[PDB]
């Protein structure tokens, strides 16, 4: 399996509709993040948002209770290909 950047991604607190997610801040630098989220399997689509580079957490709210989501965090501009990396992704059931 491929290694990821960021390296860690966790749901640190959750209600059935509202999540607090956390990843690891860079050791060096990042400009900003993009996060996508949507129901696993892609039928209902994905939403995308930016996160300032000063953060290493985000909230995602208004989710449906008991539903599986795929959440992916991108370090915008990071040279994934150079280092043979993928963006970090998790699936989470609310």
């Amino acid at each position: 399996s491929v290694s990821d950047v960021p390296t860690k991604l966790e749901v640190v607190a959750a209600t059935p509709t509202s999540l607090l997610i956390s990843w690891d801040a860079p050791a060096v630098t990042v400009d900003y993040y993009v996060i996508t989220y949507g129901e696993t399997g892609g039928w209902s689509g994905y939403q995308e948002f930016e996160v300032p580079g000063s953060k290493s957490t985000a909230t995602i709210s208004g989710l449906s209770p008991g539903v599986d989501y795929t959440i992916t965090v991108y370090a915008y501009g990071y040279p994934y290909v150079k280092y043979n990396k993928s963006p970090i992704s998790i699936n989470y059931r609310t």
Partner: protein, 100 residues
């Protein structure tokens, strides 16, 4: 062998590639093989909510290219190049899709 690359997804259909990229952003991409024609490969690339599919062509001397002006001995060299220089692609190959 190619499976070691983050961006190499093996045999995946065009329509399936679009699903794999639907959680992506501009510059999200993957390289796939035809499920019907071993050795036939394409790059699928996300831009502005859509997916652009580029056949990896083979020159008479065996070199690979997605854009005629820029040709390569290996697929890894091609992808590394186009990760920083779009050179005929709608955008650079930046974010390897997570394999699923």
């Amino acid at each position: 062998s190619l499976e070691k690359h983050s961006w190499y997804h093996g045999p995946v259909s065009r329509n399936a590639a679009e699903y794999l990229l639907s959680s992506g952003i501009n510059g999200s991409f993957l390289v796939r093989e035809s499920e019907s024609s071993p050795g036939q490969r394409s790059i699928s690339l996300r831009y502005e909510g859509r997916v652009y599919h580029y056949r990896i062509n083979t020159a008479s001397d065996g070199k690979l290219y997605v854009s005629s002006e820029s040709r390569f001995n290996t697929l890894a060299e091609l992808v590394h190049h186009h990760s920083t220089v779009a050179d005929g692609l709608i955008t650079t190959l930046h974010y390897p899709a997570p394999k699923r």
